[PDB]
Amino acid sequence: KIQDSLSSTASALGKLQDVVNHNAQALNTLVKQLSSKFGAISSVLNDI
Amino acid sequence: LICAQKFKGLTVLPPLLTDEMIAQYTSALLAGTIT
Amino acid sequence: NFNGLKGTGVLTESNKKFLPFQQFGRDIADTTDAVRDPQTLEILDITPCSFGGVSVITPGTNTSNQVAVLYQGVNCTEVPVAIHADQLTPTWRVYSTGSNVFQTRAGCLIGAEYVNNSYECDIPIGAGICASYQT
Amino acid sequence: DCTMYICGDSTECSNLLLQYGSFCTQLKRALTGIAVEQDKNTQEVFAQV
Ligand SMILES: *[C@@H]1O[C@H](CO)[C@@H](O)[C@H](O)[C@H]1NC(C)=O
Ligand SMILES: *[C@@H]1O[C@H](CO)[C@@H](O)[C@H](O)[C@H]1NC(C)=O
Numbered sequence: 001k002i003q004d005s006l007s008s009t010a011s012a013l014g015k016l017q018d019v020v021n022h023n024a025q026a027l028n029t030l031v032k033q034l035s036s037k038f039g040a041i042s043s044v045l046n047d048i
Numbered sequence: 049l050i051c052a053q054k055f056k057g058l059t060v061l062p063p064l065l066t067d068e069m070i071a072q073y074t075s076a077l078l079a080g081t082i083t
Numbered sequence: 084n085f086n087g088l089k090g091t092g093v094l095t096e097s098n099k100k101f102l103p104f105q106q107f108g109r110d111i112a113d114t115t116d117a118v119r120d121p122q123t124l125e126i127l128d129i130t131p132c133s134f135g136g137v138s139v140i141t142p143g144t145n146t147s148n149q150v151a152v153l154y155q156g157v158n159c160t161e162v163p164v165a166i167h168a169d170q171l172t173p174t175w176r177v178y179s180t181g182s183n184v185f186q187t188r189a190g191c192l193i194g195a196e197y198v199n200n201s202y203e204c205d206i207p208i209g210a211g212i213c214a215s216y217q218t
Numbered sequence: 219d220c221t222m223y224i225c226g227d228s229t230e231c232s233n234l235l236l237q238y239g240s241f242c243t244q245l246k247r248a249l250t251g252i253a254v255e256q257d258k259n260t261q262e263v264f265a266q267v
């Protein structure tokens with residue numbers, strides 16, 4: 001009965017899931033953050 | 049494709065213990081706890 | 084240098100289609116990665132040059148002065164091509180043409196051989212490989 | 219990579235970053251602490267035999 005319970009729902013392995021989501025959702029915000037200006041003229045470094 | 053959008057220097061190093069060697073530690077635990 | 088868009092990289096051929104009013108392409112990080120050559124109408128795709136990391140495998144300084152160097156996460160045939168003057172940031176490219184190269188999942192390491200017996204781990208390399216100083 | 223995330227492919231930004239001292243090598247030292255520790259968490263659970 002355990003084998004079917006594990007594969008029954010998508011929330012069975014939730015504890016191991018947000019561990020890998022938090023470590024990949026935190027990387028995207030790091031990458032998307034370098035499109036901001038922080039009060040400068042432009043976000044692109046070469047054109048300044 | 050997002051993993052290839054990491055041209056800014058964000059890399060991921062591989063773990064020291066490969067998966068096929070962790071499954072051998074677990075095998076010995078289960079074969080020395082039943083005999 | 085395309086119409087004021089200074090940069091650095093390698094230019095290739097791209098199949099993505101630009102409407103007549105578009106000249107620049109962009110990605111999630113909001114940096115340009117596709118331009119149109121202003122003399123023809125062909126589309127070019129911009130990608131940066133090869134880059135990575137370098138690690139050094141050494142025993143104690145007193146024990147010896149011999150080392151091994153690991154190139155992280157690269158196919159082992161990429162680095163021999165880049166062996167030319169004023170083309171690599173580390174200038175000690177002599178080592179790349181050193182001892183036999185063994186390819187691992189973390190990149191190929193140069194200067195250390197590969198035995199096939201088993202010992203205890205001494206200096207952990209990665210993905211099931213450990214280096215050591217032996218006879 | 220501290221030097222390339224901030225001043226990517228710009229020659230006149232990497233020189234200015236040097237005046238900030240020891241910021242980049244503190245981040246490399248902190249993240250290597252995390253990475254080395256992660257191998258201990260798996261070496262203490264499964265390797266009790
Ligand atoms: C040199 O290094 C070796 C490493 O095993 C050490 O045992 C020895 O004490 C060192 N000698 C010095 C630091 O004078
Ligand atoms: C390196 O590239 C070659 C050529 O495509 C390929 O056959 C080989 O699998 C690659 N090696 C690694 C370690 O990715």
Ligand SMILES: *[C@@H]1O[C@H](CO)[C@@H](O)[C@H](O)[C@H]1NC(C)=O
Pocket residue numbers: 198199
């Ligand atoms: C291990 O390497 C030795 C030489 O280094 C070779 O003679 C032997 O055939 C190898 N063993 C296997 C199983 O490949």
